[PDB]
Design a protein around this nucleic acid. Sequence first.
RNA 1: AAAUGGAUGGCGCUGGAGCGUCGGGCCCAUACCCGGCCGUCGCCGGCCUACGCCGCGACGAGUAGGAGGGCCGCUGCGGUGAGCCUUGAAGCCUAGGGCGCGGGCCCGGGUGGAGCCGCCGCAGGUGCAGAUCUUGGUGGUAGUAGCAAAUAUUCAAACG
RNA 2: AGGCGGCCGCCCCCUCGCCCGUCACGCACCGCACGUUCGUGGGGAACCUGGCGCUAAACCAUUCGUAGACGACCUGCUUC
Lengths: 50, 109, 153, 129, 148, 195
Amino acid sequence: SHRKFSAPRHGSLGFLPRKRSSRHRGKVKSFPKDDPSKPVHLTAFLGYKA
Amino acid sequence: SGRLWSKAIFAGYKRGLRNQREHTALLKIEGVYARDETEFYLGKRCAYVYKAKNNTVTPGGKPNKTRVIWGKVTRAHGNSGMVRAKFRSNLPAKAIGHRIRVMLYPSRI
Amino acid sequence: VRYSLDPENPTKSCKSRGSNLRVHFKNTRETAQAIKGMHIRKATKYLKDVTLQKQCVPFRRYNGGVGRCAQAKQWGWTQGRWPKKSAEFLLHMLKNAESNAELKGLDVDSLVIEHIQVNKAPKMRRRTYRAHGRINPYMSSPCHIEMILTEKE
Amino acid sequence: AALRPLVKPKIVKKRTKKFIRHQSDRYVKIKRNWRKPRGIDNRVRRRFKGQILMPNIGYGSNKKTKHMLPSGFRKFLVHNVKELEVLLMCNKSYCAEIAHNVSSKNRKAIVERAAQLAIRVTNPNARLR
Amino acid sequence: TFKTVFAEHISDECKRRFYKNWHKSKKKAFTKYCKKWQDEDGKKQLEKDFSSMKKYCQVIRVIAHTQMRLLPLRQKKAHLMEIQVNGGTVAEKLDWARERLEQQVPVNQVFGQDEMIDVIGVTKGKGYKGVTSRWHTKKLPRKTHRGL
Amino acid sequence: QVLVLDGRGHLLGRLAAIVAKQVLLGRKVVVVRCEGINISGNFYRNKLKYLAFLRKRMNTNPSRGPYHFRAPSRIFWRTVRGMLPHKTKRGQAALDRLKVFDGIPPPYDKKKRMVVPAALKVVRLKPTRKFAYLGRLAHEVGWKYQAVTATLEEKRKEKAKIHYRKKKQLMRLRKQAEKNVEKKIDKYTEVLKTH
RNA sequence: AAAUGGAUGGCGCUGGAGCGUCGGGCCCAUACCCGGCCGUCGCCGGCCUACGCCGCGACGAGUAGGAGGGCCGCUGCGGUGAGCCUUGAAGCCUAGGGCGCGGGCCCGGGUGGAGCCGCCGCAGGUGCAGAUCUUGGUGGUAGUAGCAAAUAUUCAAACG
RNA sequence: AGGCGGCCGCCCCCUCGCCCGUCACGCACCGCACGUUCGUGGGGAACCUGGCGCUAAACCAUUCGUAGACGACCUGCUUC
Ligand SMILES: [Mg+2]
Ligand SMILES: [Mg+2]
Ligand SMILES: [Mg+2]
Ligand SMILES: [Mg+2]
Ligand SMILES: [Mg+2]
Ligand SMILES: [Mg+2]
Ligand SMILES: [Mg+2]
Ligand SMILES: [Mg+2]
Ligand SMILES: [Mg+2]
Ligand SMILES: [Mg+2]
Ligand SMILES: [Mg+2]
Ligand SMILES: [Mg+2]
Ligand SMILES: [Mg+2]
Ligand SMILES: [Mg+2]
Ligand SMILES: [Mg+2]
Ligand SMILES: [Mg+2]
Ligand SMILES: [Mg+2]
Ligand SMILES: [Mg+2]
Ligand SMILES: [Mg+2]
Ligand SMILES: [Mg+2]
Ligand SMILES: [Mg+2]
Ligand SMILES: [Mg+2]
């Protein structure tokens, strides 16, 4: 052991369950919070990368 | 009309920690929770009622799907008021956590 | 000769057999299991679809290393393969069973395949030429095939 | 209701398993007959709990209930008329049993002579037309 | 999900979204649901569903889709979206949604210029690639038998 | 049949012992209000032990291996799992018979809840010793559902008040009826034979 | 203060399910006592196979090893059963019935078609789970690896 | 994690819907067990009848590339 040259690790553990997503439209995991002081509006639309 | 048998739950066999003895069975009988309370039930007769799809029945009128292994109370067990019982045939071990009737005959009322 | 699983009666039943025929035993077992339990015209159209690669044969038991196909979803299975030579031989023996039913005088439009059976024949050995001057066997696997058909009522 | 032999008690055998040989389940080259293992590490010879039981002298049945059929007789095999007629004196405890190589033509005469002499036969209605 | 209340006139692009094979499908979706819209007794069983919606829910999401006829694409299927209305009280959010059923929502109505708005999507397909292209690890040198 | 147990003011190990003993006999027991089950000791010690329990995990694959629930109902269900023989079809059937809930479900709003005296904080613990709340521990580590469960709990407490006022009104009416006359002829029998 | 995540066995436990002193009950081992059965040994009974039949009492574990018994088994030999049978012998199979503690055995049912067994003595090339055991056959691997050194084939017709 | 309960107006009717007293019977199956239960128990295949209704969707094939080792994923198909 005692690797003698410590290197920063490749990749990220937070992106590890890598998979073809069963959805193809990217769904929203979390919408922003609400409060009765703000007026009525929407949050998310659809688009196409032209 | 009306139930004539007291309720008891088959708890397990007479055992140590490792090995068992299937000739004597243990009954947690309801109402009794004391060594002085498991005295009236000494000498009662028990009955495990179960079902099967063939037809081996009593002469009580009509044939049905009911089978019973008979037996009776031998002695008391523990300070919690448990009841030992030696049945005529040994237990199928499916009866754990199930109910065995304790009928109020030959005891000394 | 004798057959396993003799029918209810030999009047409404025909029979056929092939013996010592150069195929793969596993492929013929799987196409026999795909055939069994089906009307004879549906089995004939099914084997024509196997030879034309439009409908597959699922590999259920002898399924080692066999690649998948989209056509196996009719069978509730994932793997599949299209045995041309096994389909040709079993279609030839279905034609033989059809001709034997015509000889026995049955209503030839309403036959189902009640019994089919496939078992390993005596195989023939050749040799390979592997490394270091060693000789290893190169053995066949032919099969005996029996089928008992029955009228549908 | 055939011959009704003498006073025969409740016949017990003290176990009725005809003990299996160790690892006869794992290998089908091993016949199911018992054979005493003489290994230096074997759990059966060491008599661990939960393992199989070795047949020893303790499983001996009672001498009153030894070699006893469940009908209440003791079997004795017979080939012909003389070996059937030797059972004329002890027919109420010792029953007859016709050999397997006896043909039907002599077998019917043997069972007829047994019915005349009131000797129990274990196979009365076998190998008949 | 308490209950989902759809609109009356559902477009053919949404019907193509609900079906898989639009050719083999007989186009039979929402016939009884439009009959429930048309019937007078069905309206009282439908306006009562909003009365329970005013009482028990706090998160109300509005389903919207895209018009594929205005696009140069070839998919012709409208993608459905639940959009959480983060407005005021449940009563006026429900009144807003029932007022703006079967209507168009432009981007200039909700969004605006210089608004920092995040993008969620799906990455490219690069296929079943190797380790030095996936995790960007360091390659082995030239002398390495069995893989670099 | 069913044994609907309170969890307000009970101890984890004592209640788990009594539930795990009474579930092997066949009595279908359900522990409700699991967020109020007290744990003896210091709260920093309890969350330190639970943090060590979170630290215990498989290093090669954390999914295939140790699961660590954060909800207090599943905490108590793991506590009863660790006491029943769950690797055999006696404790597995006992865990199938056992049901656990956080908050109170709507059938258990109506059905009466039992209180075990052998597992109570006041019966088992000295009153000058520290304690903790399992719902507080669960909200501090993982279980993000205290604000919904407490709101629904206040709602069912208001329902329980508006039912108890009607029940107490009916009890006052039936005791006015008992205060009224011409019922004492049977009471001459009943007071002698145990009114 | 130590390296994978982890151990009063774990769960857990604080008016104890911790600590030290103790009381009464309760649970069981192949240990003890009584009783039923087998075997060994000792003492003994009878003028009922005397190598058989009973009676009493105490004891039974065990590798290496040593004895006694086997109405356990295989092959062949001489006496012996007025033995068995082509109306079915040996062999083989069997969710059939049974015996002996066990070696094994007897009967029933299904193929088979010409030899076989019991008792008493005699003689063995006489019992297999192993030996990188010898010969022969067959599985998992497995319809897997592999049909890739040397630039390349394509259309139509013909016998079939 | 909801389905039973409460009120109002009528309906085919019941004043023995319950305790106290009198009367006479119903199997009194002659000593015997598994008997009486929430059961019009759970789900599966069919048989004949009343009313109200229902008239499809996946998979293969083909195409497509925003995807692909093979599967898998996103797609088109009307006669305007
Ligand atoms: Mg989320
Ligand atoms: Mg594999
Ligand atoms: Mg493969
Ligand atoms: Mg080669
Ligand atoms: Mg040793
Ligand atoms: Mg690509
Ligand atoms: Mg090299
Ligand atoms: Mg610990
Ligand atoms: Mg103590
Ligand atoms: Mg010894
Ligand atoms: Mg012999
Ligand atoms: Mg030799
Ligand atoms: Mg020799
Ligand atoms: Mg061998
Ligand atoms: Mg050996
Ligand atoms: Mg070898
Ligand atoms: Mg091989
Ligand atoms: Mg290949
Ligand atoms: Mg490969
Ligand atoms: Mg080459
Ligand atoms: Mg041509
Ligand atoms: Mg030609």
